Swiss-Prot record, chain A:
<protein>
    <recommendedName>
        <fullName>Large ribosomal subunit protein uL22m</fullName>
    </recommendedName>
</protein>
<dbReference type="GO" id="GO:0003723">
    <property type="term" value="F:RNA binding"/>
</dbReference>
<dbReference type="GO" id="GO:0005739">
    <property type="term" value="C:mitochondrion"/>
</dbReference>
<dbReference type="GO" id="GO:0032543">
    <property type="term" value="P:mitochondrial translation"/>
</dbReference>
<keyword id="KW-0689">Ribosomal protein</keyword>
<keyword id="KW-0496">Mitochondrion</keyword>
<dbReference type="GO" id="GO:0005762">
    <property type="term" value="C:mitochondrial large ribosomal subunit"/>
</dbReference>
Curated annotation (Swiss-Prot), chain B:
<comment type="similarity">
    <text>Belongs to the universal ribosomal protein uL13 family.</text>
</comment>
<feature type="modified residue" description="N-acetylserine">
    <location>
        <position position="1"/>
    </location>
</feature>
<comment type="subunit">
    <text>Component of the mitochondrial large ribosomal subunit (mt-LSU). Mature mammalian 55S mitochondrial ribosomes consist of a small (28S) and a large (39S) subunit. The 28S small subunit contains a 12S ribosomal RNA (12S mt-rRNA) and 30 different proteins. The 39S large subunit contains a 16S rRNA (16S mt-rRNA), a copy of mitochondrial valine transfer RNA (mt-tRNA(Val)), which plays an integral structural role, and 52 different proteins. Interacts with OXA1L.</text>
</comment>
<protein>
    <recommendedName>
        <fullName>Large ribosomal subunit protein uL13m</fullName>
    </recommendedName>
</protein>
Swiss-Prot record, chain C:
<dbReference type="GO" id="GO:0005739">
    <property type="term" value="C:mitochondrion"/>
</dbReference>
<dbReference type="GO" id="GO:0019843">
    <property type="term" value="F:rRNA binding"/>
</dbReference>
<comment type="similarity">
    <text>Belongs to the bacterial ribosomal protein bL20 family.</text>
</comment>
<keyword id="KW-0687">Ribonucleoprotein</keyword>
<protein>
    <recommendedName>
        <fullName>Large ribosomal subunit protein bL20m</fullName>
    </recommendedName>
</protein>
<keyword id="KW-0809">Transit peptide</keyword>
<comment type="subunit">
    <text>Component of the mitochondrial large ribosomal subunit (mt-LSU). Mature mammalian 55S mitochondrial ribosomes consist of a small (28S) and a large (39S) subunit. The 28S small subunit contains a 12S ribosomal RNA (12S mt-rRNA) and 30 different proteins. The 39S large subunit contains a 16S rRNA (16S mt-rRNA), a copy of mitochondrial valine transfer RNA (mt-tRNA(Val)), which plays an integral structural role, and 52 different proteins. Interacts with OXA1L.</text>
</comment>
Length: 159, 59, 140
RNA sequence: ACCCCUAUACCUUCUGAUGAAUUAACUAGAAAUAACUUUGCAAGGAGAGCCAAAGCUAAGACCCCCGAAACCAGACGAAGCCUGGUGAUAGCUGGUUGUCCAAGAUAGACAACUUUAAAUUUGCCCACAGAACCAAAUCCCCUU
RNA sequence: ACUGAACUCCUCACACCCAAUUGGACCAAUCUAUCACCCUAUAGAAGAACUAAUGUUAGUAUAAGUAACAUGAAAACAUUCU
RNA sequence: AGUUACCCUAGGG
């Protein structure tokens, strides 16, 4: 049992200078011991990994999976504590920076040992618009990289 | 000599287009020369990982 | 248990630090890592021979290319430079080919001239004055 | 990073199929008679007994793990089963955990080869001569 | 003529490619005697070192989110129906 | 001294 994710919300950064970019808010939340497999909840966690909070909530409210409701609840709680506890003025101005699942303390039952599986859902929200996805590299990027590779070659094994 | 670094490198590793007439010639003898130049084994700069082959055009 | 090994993390670590750049479970699991690390060490020990052999092959390839640039052949160049008391090794000849190409052309011409001298010497058998570049400096 | 070149996993058993998912822990050489080494003392040693034709006293340093069917005794159930004898025994596998240096593999019917230490003097290779009547060579062997 | 070894030379270093076995020298960790005092020294000792025993125990994988398992229907969840 | 299609155990082909 390690509970670092909870402790990650107690970091007090020093106050900033006027000539310094505004540090975006960072919120960490998790739910422990969810009666669900980490393998199944990995899909739901991956689905929402760069979405805005509103998009993620929309996606999860229409997933048929059991873990969708649980992740939705965790996200709503995170949004509430963001606006209230962590000084995030806009509910909309959040995005899922991190969304993973770990394994919990699973139980063992006798049938023939079978495992009652539990898991943790971890999320980190950051203040601001979701970062735009990386554009697919063009032919110009490919050609530039190839020419650089050609230019970087040396006369091997000599003076 | 006395080139800049980038042009010197470019000149050393540039690929040359060779022409080979195959009329009345044995195909294996053509192939020997083509294989030598295609690998770059005709260049003193040759290394197997330098990618220093040349173009061979056989008519 | 009167005495048992307390310092066993460090023996495992001794093996594992050489396996961090492997693939799969070899980089983590000691039992698999040890096998792969033993094999890697034997390869590293035996690769010194191959390093030397491959270096000479590369030098010979590059000198062959260089001498065919002047119409010579590697046997001709090497042999006829030896006959001129020019003890340049393959390594240096390859660096001369790449980096000092006028000196390489001069050496190729010297080899060619010695070779023609040899052909003349063998053709006209008998008592004829030796080739100028065929003359050998004696030491004592 | 890959591309190139090189590279028949390992252990065991054969003259050269077996086992192992992985991690952590556990897991396997026990005998000082003589001899040797190092001390003490010395025709004596030893704190009775014992040994002594330089001996005697003391120390050091040599001898693994797992794995039958059985048999016996007494119970418990309806020959079986259990406990004890029992770490039974016999075969045959398998396993036996740090490093370095030195020496270190093929006859046979205990022997051969091998290790350590010690004492001494020839060892190997071999030239003439020399070894049976009814081919190769071998034995012997001074020189070197 | 050239290519071609761990052979030989070359610059330096040299005790540093045999099974069991035997002999010699070191030695991790532990405990003790005395030191030492950010982890050691000289000795004495010993349940004293594990990539393997269809070894034992515990954790977690693979197979695998696979095989398999479950609740008759509508509704006011009263009831009615099949 | 035979025998075990009731055979049994460790191994080998």
């Amino acid at each position: 049992i390690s509970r670092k994710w909870e402790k990650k919300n107690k970091i007090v950064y020093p106050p900033q200078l006027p000539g310094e970019p505004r540090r975006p808010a960072e919120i960490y939340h998790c739910r422990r011991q969810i009666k669900y497999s980490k393998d199944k909840m990995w899909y739901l966690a991956k689905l929402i990994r760069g979405m805005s909070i509103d998009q993620a909530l929309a996606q999860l409210e229409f997933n048929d999976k059991k873990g969708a409701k649980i992740i939705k609840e965790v996200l709503l709680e995170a949004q509430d504590m963001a606006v209230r506890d962590h000084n995030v003025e806009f509910r909309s101005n959040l995005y899922i920076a991190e969304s993973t699942s770990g394994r919990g303390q699973c139980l063992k039952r006798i049938r023939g040992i079978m495992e009652k599986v539990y898991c943790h859902y971890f999320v980190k929200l950051v203040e601001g618009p979701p970062p735009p996805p990386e554009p697919p590299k063009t032919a110009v990027a490919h050609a530039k990289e190839y020419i650089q590779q050609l230019r970087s070659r040396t006369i091997v094994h000599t003076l | 000599s006395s080139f800049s670094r980038a042009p010197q490198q470019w000149a050393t590793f540039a690929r040359i287009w060779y022409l080979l007439d195959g009329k009345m010639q044995p195909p294996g003898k053509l192939a020997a020369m083509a294989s030598i130049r295609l690998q770059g084994l005709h260049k003193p700069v040759y290394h197997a990982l330098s990618d220093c082959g040349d173009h061979v055009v056989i008519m | 248990l009167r005495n048992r090994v307390t310092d066993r993390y460090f023996r495992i670590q001794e093996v594992l630090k050489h396996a961090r750049h492997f693939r799969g479970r070899k980089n983590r699991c000691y039992r698999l890592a040890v096998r792969t690390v033993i094999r890697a060490f034997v390869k590293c020990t035996k690769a010194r021979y191959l390093k030397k052999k491959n270096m000479r092959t590369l030098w010979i390839n590059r000198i062959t290319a260089a001498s065919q640039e002047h119409g010579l052949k590697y046997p001709a160049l090497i042999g006829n430079l030896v006959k001129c008391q020019v003890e340049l090794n393959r390594k240096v000849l390859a660096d001369l080919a790449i980096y000092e190409p006028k000196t390489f052309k001069s050496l190729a011409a010297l080899a060619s001239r010695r070779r023609h001298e040899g052909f003349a010497a063998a053709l006209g058998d008998g008592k004829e004055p030796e080739g100028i570049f065929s003359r050998v400096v004696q030491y004592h």
